[PDB]
Amino acid sequence: TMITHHHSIVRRVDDIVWQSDYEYAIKHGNEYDYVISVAKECKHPRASLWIPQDDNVYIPADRYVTVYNFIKQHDNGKSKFLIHCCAGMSRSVAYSIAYLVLRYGITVSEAKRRMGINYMLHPDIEKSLVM
Amino acid sequence: THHHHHHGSIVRRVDDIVWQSDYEYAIKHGNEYDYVISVAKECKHPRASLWIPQDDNVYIPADRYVTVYNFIKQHDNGKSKFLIHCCAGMSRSVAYSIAYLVLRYGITVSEAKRRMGINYMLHPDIEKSLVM
Ligand code: NI
Ligand code: NI
């Protein structure tokens, strides 16, 4: 018999950085000076920075540092940054946590608390966040 | 904004003794048939009398078309109904049904399509396979 069903994530990271899913980034990307796509399969058409990142795998520190460096070096006190993946639960949350850790010298727990992340990412992503 | 997952259950008459369908029809009406023939790898009827592990969108070797034609001819005792099904009922089971009609009745692919009301081209490699 016929079935009728339906199947947007955005979180503030700090004063200057937001984290989202692809849907939010497409609909609201123009509200940001810089869009950072950290999913291989969800590359914003006007992404300033794209890391072709697979999900559910260990993320090397050099990727975390590339994104942190990108934000810090373009932080002119007037710029807003959006980090997004596809569903906005795994890859963009990890890069966002890593940015907070690298920039403010806080723990992974404290980063999550600030962003309101109350879950565990893929074991291998959580491992990657202990740099 | 919501979306719909419509029901299948599509069935075409092939000849006096043979019907062609999607998996949904085969599941819900299988018991109305003496012999269910499954010609999809991934849609094997739990009471299939014959199963060909056929992938879609590929050349079908003559050997397979002949296996199905022979199976129906051999079990055609004047008292038996046959159902040939794949998954969506538009490609693999249509190709095997067309090949059965060509082999048994010496008509053309185009005439077999006409009888069955097939107003479309199958995958190019399937169309190649039907020109035996
Ligand atoms: Ni759906
Ligand atoms: Ni509707």
**Chain-chain contact of B3 with A1 (C-beta, under 8 angstroms):** no
Asked if the structure places residue A110 within a domain, the reply is: yes
Asked if the structure places residue A126 within a domain, the reply is: yes
In angstroms, what CA-CA distances link B8 with A63, B28, B101?
47, 11, 24
**Chain-chain contact of A5 with B5 (C-beta, under 8 angstroms):** yes
Tokens of A102: 């690298």
- Does A5 reach chain B within 8 Å, measured CB to CB? yes
Report d(CA A93, CA B76) in Å as an integer.
64
Per-position DSSP letters for B30-77, written without gaps between them: GGG-SEEEE--TT---TT-SEE--PPSSSPPPHHHHHHHHHHHHHH--
Report d(CA B92, CA B123) in Å as an integer.
10
Query: Gaps after which residues in chain B, C–N over 2.5 Å?
Result: none
In angstroms, what is the resolution?
A: 2.0
Q: Which residues are paired to B51 by β-bridges?
A: B38
Other Cβ atoms closer than 10 A to B59: 13
CATH number of the domain enclosing A111: 3.90.190.10
**Chain-chain contact of B4 with A6 (C-beta, under 8 angstroms):** no
CA distance B8 to chain A (A): 8
Q: Which residues of B touch A6 (CB under 8 A)?
A: 1-3
Q: Which residues are paired to A81 by β-bridges?
A: A17, A34
CA distance A64 to chain B (A): 36
Report d(CA A107, CA A66) in Å as an integer.
20
Sign for the pseudo-dihedral over CA of B100, B103, B108, B111: negative
Cα(A6) to ligand 2 centroid in Å equals 11
Other Cβ atoms closer than 10 A to B116: 17
Phi, psi of B20 (to 5 degrees): -125, 140
Asked if the structure places residue A36 within a domain, the reply is: yes
Report d(CA A47, CA B66) in Å as an integer.
55
Up-side HSE of residue A107: CA atoms within 13 Å toward CB?
3
Asked if the structure places residue B4 within a domain, the reply is: no
Report d(CA B75, CA B58) in Å as an integer.
28
- Does A120 reach chain B within 8 Å, measured CB to CB? no
Cα(A5) to ligand 2 centroid in Å equals 9
Asked if the structure places residue B6 within a domain, the reply is: no
Residue B99 CB contacts under 8 Å (≥ 6 apart), including other chains: B60, B65, B68, B69, B130, B132
Q: Which regions of A1-131 does DSSP assign to beta strands (E)? A: 3-5, 10-12, 17-20, 34-37, 49-50, 81-84
Cβ atoms of residues A20 and A10 within 8 Å: yes
Report d(CA A93, CA B25) in Å as an integer.
45
Report d(CA A15, CA A12) in Å as an integer.
8
DSSP A63: H
In this complex, how many residue pairs, one in chain A and one in chain B, have their CB atoms less than 8 Å apart?
A: 16
Q: Which residues of A touch B3 (CB under 8 A)?
A: 4-6
Q: Which of A2, A4, A6 shows the shortest C-beta gap to B7? A: A2
Q: Which regions of A10-122 does DSSP assign to beta strands (E)? A: 10-12, 17-20, 34-37, 49-50, 81-84
The structural domain count of chain A equals 1
Q: Which of B85, B83, B130 is nearest to B108 (CA)?
A: B130
Phi, psi of B91 (to 5 degrees): -120, -85
Report d(CA B8, CA B22) in Å as an integer.
7
Q: Which of B128, B46, B54, B127 is nearest to B86 (CA)?
A: B54
Asked if the structure places residue B2 within a domain, the reply is: no
- Give kind and range of the element (H or E) at residue B114: helix B109-116
Q: How far apart are the first and last CA of chain A?
A: 52
Phi, psi of B21 (to 5 degrees): -155, 175
- Per the structure, the complete domain to which residue B80 belongs is given by 11-131
Asked if the structure places residue B1 within a domain, the reply is: no
Asked if the structure places residue B18 within a domain, the reply is: yes
**Chain-chain contact of A6 with B7 (C-beta, under 8 angstroms):** no
DSSP B17: S
Closest residue, chain A, to B6 (C-alpha): A2
- Does B4 reach chain A within 8 Å, measured CB to CB? yes
In angstroms, what CA-CA distances link B131 with A13, A31, B76, B89, B106?
63, 59, 25, 21, 12
Residue A98 CB contacts under 8 Å (≥ 6 apart), including other chains: A59, A64, A67, A68, A128, A129, A131
Residue type, B96: Y
In angstroms, what CA-CA distances link B104 with B31, B100, B107?
25, 6, 8
Would you give the distance in Å from CA A131 to the centre of its chain? 17
Write down the experimental method used for this entry. X-ray
